[PDB]
From a paper:
In summary, we have described the cryo-EM structure of [name]-[name], an electron-bifurcating hydrogenase consisting of a conventional [name]-hydrogenase module (SL subunits) and of a bifurcating module (ABC subunits) that is highly similar to a previously characterized bifurcating heterotrimeric FeFe-hydrogenase. We report cryo-EM structures of the related [name]-[name] hydrogenase that reversibly oxidizes H2 and couples endergonic reduction of ferredoxin with exergonic reduction of NAD. Here, we report cryo–electron microscopy (cryo-EM) structures of [name]-[name] determined in a flavin-free apo state, in an “electron bifurcation-ready” (BR) state, and in a “post-electron bifurcation” (PB) state. The structures of the [name]-enzyme show that none of the previous proposals for the site of bifurcation in [FeFe]-HydABC hydrogenases are likely to be correct and that instead electron bifurcation occurs at a single NAD(H)-binding flavin in combination with a unique arrangement of three iron-sulfur clusters.
No density for the expected FMN was observed in the EM map, indicating that the as-purified complex is in the flavin-free apo state. Flavoenzymes typically have a lower affinity for flavin in their reduced states, and in this regard, the absence of FMN in the [name]-HydB structure is consistent with the reduced state of HydSL in our structure. Therefore, [name]-HydSL is in the reduced active state and brief air exposure during EM grid preparation did not oxidize the catalytic center. The NTD and CTD of [name]-HydB were partially flexible, although EM densities were clearly visible. In the FMN-free apo state structure of [name]-[name], the distances between the C1 and B2 [2Fe-2S] clusters (19 Å) and between B2 and the B3 [4Fe-4S] clusters (18 Å) are too far to transfer electrons. Substantial conformational changes must therefore occur when FMN and/or NAD bind to enable electron transfer from FMN to B3, and this is discussed below. However, B5 is close enough to the C1 cluster (11 Å) for electron transfer in the FMN-free apo state, so the possibility of B5 being involved in electron transfer to Fd cannot be entirely ruled out. Direct electron transfer between B1 and C1 is highly unlikely based on our structure, as the closest (side-to-side) distance between them is more than 22 Å, which is too far for electron transfer to occur. The HydC CTD position is stabilized by the HydB NTD in the FMN-free apo state, and the movement of the HydC CTD during the bifurcation process needs the HydB NTD to be released. In the absence of NAD and FMN, the HydB CTD is disordered, while the HydC CTD is stable.
Numbering used by the authors:
A (entry chain A): 1 to 277
B (entry chain D): 397 to 450
C (entry chain D): 4 to 238
D (entry chain C), E (entry chain H): 5 to 156
F (entry chain B): 113 to 537
Write the structure that this text describes.
Amino acid sequence: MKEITLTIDGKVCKGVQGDTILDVANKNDVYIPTLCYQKGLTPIGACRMCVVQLEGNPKMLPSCTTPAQDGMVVVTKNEKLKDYRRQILELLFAGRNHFCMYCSQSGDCELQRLAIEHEMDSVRFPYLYEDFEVDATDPNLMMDHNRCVLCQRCIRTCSEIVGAHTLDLERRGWQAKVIADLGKRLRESDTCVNCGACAQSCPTGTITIREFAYRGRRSECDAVVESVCPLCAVGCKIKTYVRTGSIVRVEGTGVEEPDGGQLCHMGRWWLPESTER
Amino acid sequence: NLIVATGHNNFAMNKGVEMVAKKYITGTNVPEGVFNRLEHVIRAYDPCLSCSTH
Amino acid sequence: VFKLEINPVTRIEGHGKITVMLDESGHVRETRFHVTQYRGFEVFTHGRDFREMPVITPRICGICPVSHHLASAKACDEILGVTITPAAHKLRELMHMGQIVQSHALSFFHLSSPDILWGFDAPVKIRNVAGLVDRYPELAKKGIMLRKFGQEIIKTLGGKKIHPWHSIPGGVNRSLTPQERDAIAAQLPEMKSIAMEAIKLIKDYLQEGGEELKEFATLDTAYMGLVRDGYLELY
Amino acid sequence: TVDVVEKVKEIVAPWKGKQGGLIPILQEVQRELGYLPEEALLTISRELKMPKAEVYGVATFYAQFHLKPRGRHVIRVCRGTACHVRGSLQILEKVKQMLGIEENETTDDLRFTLEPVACLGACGLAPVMMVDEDTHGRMTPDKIQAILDKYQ
Amino acid sequence: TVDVVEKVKEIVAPWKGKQGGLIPILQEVQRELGYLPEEALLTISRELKMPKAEVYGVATFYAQFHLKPRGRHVIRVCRGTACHVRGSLQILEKVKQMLGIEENETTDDLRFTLEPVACLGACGLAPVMMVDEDTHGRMTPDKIQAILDKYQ
Amino acid sequence: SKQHRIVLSNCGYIDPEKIEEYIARDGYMALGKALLEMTPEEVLEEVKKSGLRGRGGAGFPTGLKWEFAKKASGDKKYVICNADEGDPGAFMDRSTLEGDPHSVIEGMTIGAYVIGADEGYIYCRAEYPLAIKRLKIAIAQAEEMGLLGDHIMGTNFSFHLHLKEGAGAFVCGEETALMASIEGRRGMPRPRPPFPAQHGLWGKPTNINNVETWANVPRIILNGADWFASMGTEKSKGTKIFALTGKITNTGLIEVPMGITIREIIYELGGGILNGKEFKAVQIGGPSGGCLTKEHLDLPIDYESLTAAGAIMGSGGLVVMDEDTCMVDVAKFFLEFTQRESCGKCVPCREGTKQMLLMLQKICNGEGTMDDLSKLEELAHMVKETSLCGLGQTAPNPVITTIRYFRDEYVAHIKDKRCPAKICP
Ligand code: SF4
Ligand code: SF4
Ligand code: SF4
Ligand code: SF4
Ligand code: SF4
Ligand code: FES
Ligand code: FES
Ligand code: FES
Ligand code: FES
Ligand code: 3NI
C-alpha cells in the first residue's frame, strides 16, 4: 500500500510509501527540529537533530533519512531526545564562534530558533575559540565561517541546483571548512555565477547578502508578497519581503520546481536594490 | 579609530581629582565625605568609561 | 610611600579607580584616575564588513548605544558617499535627541542627584536611586519619566531601547507614523516641566554653595564642541 | 612553471571518458612530483571536467596527499597503539622540539618532514621511527640525534 | 632570528677597541653561518660603532662574501687563463644552462651554487670543476652530469 | 604455540610470488569445485548454514549478507575487499595480504560467482608498499591461469579483480565511504537508504565484506559446513586472526579458534607481561572497540558474549596495557586517532570527539572536575547514539567502557591529583 499510516507523537499521520519520517511529518502538521534539511536538496544527514525514536527499538534514528515503514510509533518529543538535541546545539555553539549580537541573521538563524526552542541558557561544552576566516572579499556575499554548522546545504545547492560547483568541503574532521575553488576566496573564484542561492540555503548566517544586511530579515518584515521576477523570461517565482516600502530580501519559491529557488544576481540583487532608487 | 567622549575629559578628571584631593587632605583617618567629593568630580562629567575604553 | 584607592568608583558607568598617593606627612603627592577595563573594539573589527559596524559599535556602551550607532552610520555613509536624505537627517537627529534626553536624565537623576541633594557627607545607605525613591518620591519618578521618554523615542525608532538598530549605512530604516508622533508630542509639556524643575533645583544648589562650588575642580581648559553656522548642533 | 602543465595533462589521458579515478589520478602526480601544486589540481579539474572545489576537497581530505612541497627525507614516527603504549609520543614530541617545526609540516628549506603514520608493521620492535629508508626498532630518547644528523 | 644576534656579538669581542679588523670579523661569521645576513652586518655595525654603509660596502666589495644564503654544495668552475684557453667556458655555460640558475646565484631550494673561481691550482689538469669536495681533472662536456647528480 | 590456525594456515610457508605452491596447497580446487559442480544457490546455502560471522568489525551472518546482495534488481553487482585496517596498530590485513595473497582472490571469485557479480575491487592501503606488489603479482600470475577473465574454468563467467590503493583514511573503512573513495570522491558516509547492497558502487549493487571474512570463504566448500562448525561455541561460528601486540613478550598474529578464556590468550600464549608486572587492561576491538580488565578472564571471546560487555570484536587489534600506562591517556589517544580519521559530516563526531578530547586532556592534566566527568559520560553516550555511520557510533567506546571499568580511576585523576603513569600531574 502506497498510503501508509504511522503515529508521530500520538498524532496519526498519512504518507506515501517511499517517504521518510520527516516527509510524513511535514506533510500533516507535526514539527521535528531540523537544521540541515532544505526542502528540495536530498536529505543530508549531518546535524543529527531530527533524531526520533521508534517504540520498542531503544535506539534513535534520523527522521530525514530513515524511511516510513507501513505502520510504526514515532516519538519526537521526550526527555532524552530534548537532552541530545540540546547537546548537539551546544556543541555547535561551542565549536564555532557564534556571536548573535552582531549577526545579520539574528531572528532568522535556524540554529538560533532551535537554541531558544530548546531553552539553551548555556553552552556546557568548553568554548573552542579557534580562528575561522571571514571571507568578505566578494562585494555581494560574505562568508563568516565562525557561524558555519557545516550542513552542506550550500555545497548541495551549488552542486545540484546551480551546478557551478563552487563550494565544497576542504579538510576532514574538525578542520572541515567550506571553500571556494582550490581553497580560494569567493571573489577569486572563476566559477561563482554570483547567484545567492547559497545565501538562501544557509540557515546559520555564514553566507549573507551584504548590501541588504540587517534589513533583509524575515522576522522583521512588514509583508511577504509572492510574485514573478520580471527581469528575464524564466520568470522565477519570488517571495519578496517588504519592510517599510522597500523590498529587503528576495528569496525564490519553487524549491519543488526544477529550478530550485536559485534566482540569479539580477533577481536577488537588483530587485531589492531597485526599491531604493 | 574611535575617539570617544570621556577620553577628552580624562585630563580634566585627573586634574580635578588632584585639586579636590589637595584641598581635602587629612594626614590620617581618611574620611568618607572627602571620598564622595573625589568621586563627585568624576560624576560631574558622569563618564561612560566603557566608551572611553572601547 | 603609600596610597589610597577608591576602587570601585561608584555611580559612574564602567570601571574606575581613583588612587591618591600621599607623602610621609600625609599630604597628597599626586592623584590619578584609572579606567580598569578594556575590551578592544579597535581590534575586534578587523575583517568585518563595514555594514556590521553600526551593530558592533553600539555594544561599546548602553547609556549611549545610539551615539555609537549614529557615528558608525555617518562613517559608513561617508564610506558609501551618500547625501543623505533630509528625512534621514531629521530622524537620526530625533533619535539622537531622545538619547541626549535619556542619558542626561540618567546622569542627573540616577547618578549625580544624591550628592546634589543630600550633600557629599550624607550616609552611604541613602546615597543611591533607592533612597531617592524613598525620601523624594516625586523627583525620582520625574527623572524616571524623562529617561523613559528618551528611551521610548529610541524604542519607537529602533526596536530595542538599549542597543537599537534604526540607522542603516546610507539612511534610516523606519519613519514615524502620525499616531506615535502625536504620542511623543503629547508628553513634551510635562517632560519640559520636569527638565525646568531640575534646572531650577540645580541652579538653587549652585547658588547656595556660592563660591566653594565655583572652585570645586574648576581648571581653565579648552572647550571642544560641534557647531552649525553659529549655533549648538548635536548631530 | 611549464614543467607542471604537461606531465599532469598526460597522466590524465588514460582516464578520459571513464567514470571515477581521481584518487589514483592524484596518487600518480604525488609519486612523480612529490606534491600536488595548485597548477596540478587546476589542470586535473580542466582535463577531467570535474569541479576545482571537488578536486581540492579530495586532495585535502586524504592524509597521504601533500599540497605543499614535502621534504627530501620524511621522518615518519609511529603513533600506533603498540608504539603509543610503549611511549612513542615522547619520541614524537622530541623530534618536534628538535626540528622546531610544527606537527605535520616541512622544514624551512625542504630537508626533513615529520609525518606521524599508522603501524609501519614493526609492532614487535616498538617504537619504530622510520627516517624514509629503513625501520628503526628501539628508538629510545637518546638515539634520535645519531640518525637525524646522518640522513641530512 | 635570535640565533644570529649573539654569535655575531661574541666574535666581535676580541676586536673591540682595536683599529681595523672588519675583513677578518666577517670571514668568521661567513665560516660559521655560511653567509652574512642583514642582521649580522647590523650587529657588526652596532658593536664596532662602524657605519652600516661601510660594513655593507666591504661586505659587497669582496667576492668571497655572500649576503644571501649560499648553497649546501658549491660548484666552483675555474675561469682561469689555463682553463679558459682549454675551453672551461663551455663547461661553465653548460652547468649554467643545466642548473638553469643565473651566473653567480644559488638554486631555488639551497642545494647547489655556481661560483666561478680563480686558479684552484690544478693548472696542469685543466679544466678543473670542483664540486665543493675534490678536484676534477678533465671535465669534458659529457662528464658534468655524472657528478652533479651524485653530490645532490 | 598452539592456536589451531586455519585462515593464515599457510601464510609465510607458501612463497607469495608463487601461485603453483598455493594450488599445490589444495587452494584453487574450491574455485573448480564451485564453478563446475556446485550450482550457485548450493554454495549460497552452504556459506549461509556455515555461520560465517562477518569479521568486518560489526559481526554478521555473511551468508545472509550475500542473500541480500543477490536479490538486488540489477546486472552489474560488485564485490569489494576492505583490506584496510581500522586500528592503526593492527597489521592483520597487512600480514594476510603478505602471506597468502591468493586466498582473498579465490574467496572473492567464489563470492562474485555466488552473488552474480562481474566487477570487483580490493581496497588495500597505499601506505603498505609491499602488500601492493605481492597482490599485483598474484593478480598477474592468476590471470595467466584462466582464473580472472573470460569464462574462468570454461563456465560462462566474467571477473576482473582490480586493486585500489587506499589514500590513507580510516573514515573509508565503513561501507558507504569505501564506495565513495572507489568512485573517486571524498569519503563521506551517505545515510542509508540508499542501501549499499541495493544501490551501492555507482548506483549498482555492492557486496563489501572483510578481507578476513573473504579469506574464510575458500575453506567453506573445500571442507564443508560442520568443519567450520567444529571449532567452538554455537552462537558465533568460525575463527578470527588477532594482531596480538602491546607490551607482553612477543607480538604477531595469534589466530585462536573461538571463545577461549582470555587467560590462555594473554597470560601464557603471549606469556606473562614485559618485566612481568601484571596487566591492568586490554583493548579487544581497537579504537572502535572497548576495554577488558581483570574480570573478563574466563569469558568466551565470541561475538555474543562481549557485545554486552561493551566491546565489538573489531579486526583483532588486542593491545595489553600494564600499570605503567594510564587509561585516560589511551582514551585520549584512541579518541585523537578517531578525531584525525573522520570526515566531518556529523555534528556528533566532529564536535563531540573534539570536546571529549579536550575534556580528557583536562582530566589527564588534573584540571578537571566532577561535572567534567558527567559531561564526558553524557557526550559519549550522545555521540554513540546519534552519529551517522558507525565509526562515531563506536568512537566513544574507549571512554564509555573505561568509565564502566575504571570509574574510580577517572575519579582518581580529578578528585585526588594522582595518575599511575607519572607523565604529567
Ligand atoms: S548564525 Fe545564528 S546562532 Fe550564530 S550568531 Fe548568527 S544568529 Fe546567532
Ligand atoms: S552565488 Fe550561486 S554559484 Fe556562487 S557559490 Fe553561491 S550558489 Fe554557488
Ligand atoms: S555555510 Fe551555511 S549552508 Fe553552508 S554548510 Fe555552512 S552552515 Fe550550512
Ligand atoms: S531570478 Fe534571474 S533568472 Fe530568474 S527570472 Fe529573475 S532575472 Fe531571470
Ligand atoms: S560519524 Fe559522522 S563525522 Fe564520523 S566518520 Fe561517520 S559520517 Fe563522518
Ligand atoms: S536534520 Fe535530519 S540530519 Fe540534518
Ligand atoms: S605499532 Fe608503530 S609499527 Fe605498528
Ligand atoms: S687554471 Fe683553472 S685551476 Fe688554475
Ligand atoms: S593520562 Fe595524563 S598522565 Fe595519566
Ligand atoms: Ni558611553
